[PDB]
Structure 1
Amino acid sequence: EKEFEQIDKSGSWAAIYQDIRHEASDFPCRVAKLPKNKNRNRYRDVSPFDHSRIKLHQEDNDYINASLIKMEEAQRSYILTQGPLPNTCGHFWEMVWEQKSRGVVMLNRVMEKGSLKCAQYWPQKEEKEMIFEDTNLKLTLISEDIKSYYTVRQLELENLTTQETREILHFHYTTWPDFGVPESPASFLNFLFKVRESGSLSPEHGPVVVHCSAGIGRSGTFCLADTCLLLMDKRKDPSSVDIKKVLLEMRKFRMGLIQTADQLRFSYLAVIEGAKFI
Structure 2
Amino acid sequence: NLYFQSMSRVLQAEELHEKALDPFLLQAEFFEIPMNFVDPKEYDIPGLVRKNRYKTILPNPHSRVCLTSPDPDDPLSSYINANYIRGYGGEEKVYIATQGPIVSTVADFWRMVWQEHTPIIVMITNIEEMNEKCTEYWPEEQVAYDGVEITVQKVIHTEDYRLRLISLKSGTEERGLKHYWFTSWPDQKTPDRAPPLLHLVREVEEAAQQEGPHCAPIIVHCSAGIGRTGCFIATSICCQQLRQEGVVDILKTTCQLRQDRGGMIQTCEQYQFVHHVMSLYEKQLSHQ
- TM category (shorter chain) comes to 0.7 to 0.9
Kept after mapping to 2: 8 A contact 1:45/1:215: no
Measured against aligned partners, the alpha-carbon deviations of 1:25-70 in whole angstroms (never above 9, x if no partner) come to 3556656453331101113671100000001113142000000011
Residue 207 of structure 1 corresponds to which residue in structure 2? 217
Cα deviation, residue 143, structure 1: 0.3
Measured against aligned partners, the alpha-carbon deviations of 1:86-135 in whole angstroms (never above 9, x if no partner) come to 121111111111111100000026982x87212111123xxx31122xx2
| Moved >6 Å (runs of 4+) | none
Matched, 1:246 2:246: no
Match of 2:121 among 99, 104, 117: 104
Residue 32 of structure 2 corresponds to which residue in structure 1? 19
Cα deviation, residue 11, structure 1: 2.5
Residue 49 of structure 2 corresponds to which residue in structure 1? 38
Residue 90 of structure 1 corresponds to which residue in structure 2? 107
Change (3 A) 1:210 1:174: same
Q: Percent identity?
A: 30
Kept after mapping to 1: 8 A contact 2:83/2:96: yes
Distance 2:97 2:214 in 1: 19
Matched, 1:2 2:15: yes
Residue 178 of structure 2 corresponds to which residue in structure 1? 169
Matched, 1:181 2:189: yes
Distance 2:125 2:45 in 1: 28
Please give the TM-score of this superposition, normalised by the length of structure 1: 0.85
Measured against aligned partners, the alpha-carbon deviations of 1:217-266 in whole angstroms (never above 9, x if no partner) come to 1011111011111122223xx23x32101110111000111111111110
Residue 155 of structure 1 corresponds to which residue in structure 2? 166
Change (3 A) 1:277 1:269: same
Change (3 A) 1:231 1:75: farther
Residue 136 of structure 2 corresponds to which residue in structure 1? 120
Cα deviation, residue 271, structure 1: 1.5
2:197 counterpart letter in structure 1 = F
Change (3 A) 1:197 1:9: closer
Please give the TM-score of this superposition, normalised by the length of structure 2: 0.82
Matched, 1:195 2:204: yes
Residue 8 of structure 2 corresponds to which residue in structure 1? none
SS, match of residue 83 in structure 2: strand
**Number of aligned positions between the proteins:** 264
- Tell which has more relative contact order, 1 or 2 (C-alpha 8 A, sep 6+): 2
SS, match of residue 262 in structure 2: coil
Change (3 A) 1:72 1:270: closer
Residue 7 of structure 2 corresponds to which residue in structure 1? none
Choose 61-70 or 1-10, whichever is displaced more: 1-10
Distance 2:44 2:189 in 1: 31
| Unaligned residue ranges in structure 2 (runs of 5+) | 1-13
Residue 260 of structure 1 corresponds to which residue in structure 2? 267
Kept after mapping to 2: 8 A contact 1:104/1:210: yes
2:81 counterpart letter in structure 1 = N
